[PDB]
Amino acid sequence: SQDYCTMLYEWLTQGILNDPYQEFMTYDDLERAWDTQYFIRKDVLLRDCDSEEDKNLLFKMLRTGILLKVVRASLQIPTIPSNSSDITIQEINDFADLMEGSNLELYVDKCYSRANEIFLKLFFQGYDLINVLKHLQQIFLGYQSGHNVLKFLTKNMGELTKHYRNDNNANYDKLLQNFELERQSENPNNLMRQLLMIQFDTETLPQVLSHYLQIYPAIYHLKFDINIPYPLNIIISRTCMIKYQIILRYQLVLQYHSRLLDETWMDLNKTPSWKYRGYSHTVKRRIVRATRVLHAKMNHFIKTIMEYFNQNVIDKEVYSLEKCYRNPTLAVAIQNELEGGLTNIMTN
């Protein structure tokens, strides 16, 4: 087994997979274009891998190897030298001693911590994960970015309503041109905003909500999407992207309704045909006052629920996501916290 210990050491220290005899317990595909699938071979395992502890150990080793291979592919280096971190791993000599003692678990935890530290340092200093999360919160969550989406809505007021009232045969080329010119005028430094793409869905927001949840339902057929590249796609999956799309569509519906209400109020308060009265009207306090009270109630409902949401859900989640990456330890843990926050938002 001197060969197997060396193979395991290489896999746990560099992520290099060299199994020409199909003996190692893990091997990846591509020996979807950037994300390869890692298959675990249970016929050549070293333990049972049935209990929760053994399953977590195997998952930790596999995650260490995956992170090592991803760092190698990102740095374009054939191997990761030990000087890149303060953690050194010793090669396995006695397989029986390694199996009977906790030295295996110690080495696995050490290499996993080293890989996680290297990955976090790389994605924090070279990729600017803080800027990435700020940009995605500005795009999908509307965090400190309401001005841009409000300007977009005010510029494409007629286009959106005409597309929602017409069928799918209505040409959205004007809306696409507006979106692309806005993206071009946007600063090229914002990679998320420059890669933001727009599209039309055949189903509505309540339709997709009823398709995804256990609820019952041609308006609001617009949505946005981001194509997460490598090696950022191994962290930003597609489920969080779909959650972001749903939250963005909901916020867009809310903002469009508030914009319609604001436009109605501005018309009612600025039109002389509305603000004019006399000639023994006897209809002013009956019609104009009634509709103004109705609009005031609609405002005190919509704006109030929007404030409640954006304060006790959106703001709280933004604060938690901002305080979570303070001295991080696991990128997978950060992703799990983000998914849990999104799940809380959706299940509120």
């Binding site: 298959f39 995804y212 597609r238 489920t239 959650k243 998914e339 799940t343 959706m346």
Partner: peptide
Amino acid sequence: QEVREHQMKKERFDRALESKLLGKRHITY
């Protein structure tokens, strides 16, 4: 047990959404 059933409902919603999102769990030969 109220927080427990709330977390259970959240976990059920998460499982439903993960099963709807392409089913990342797979097995090969």
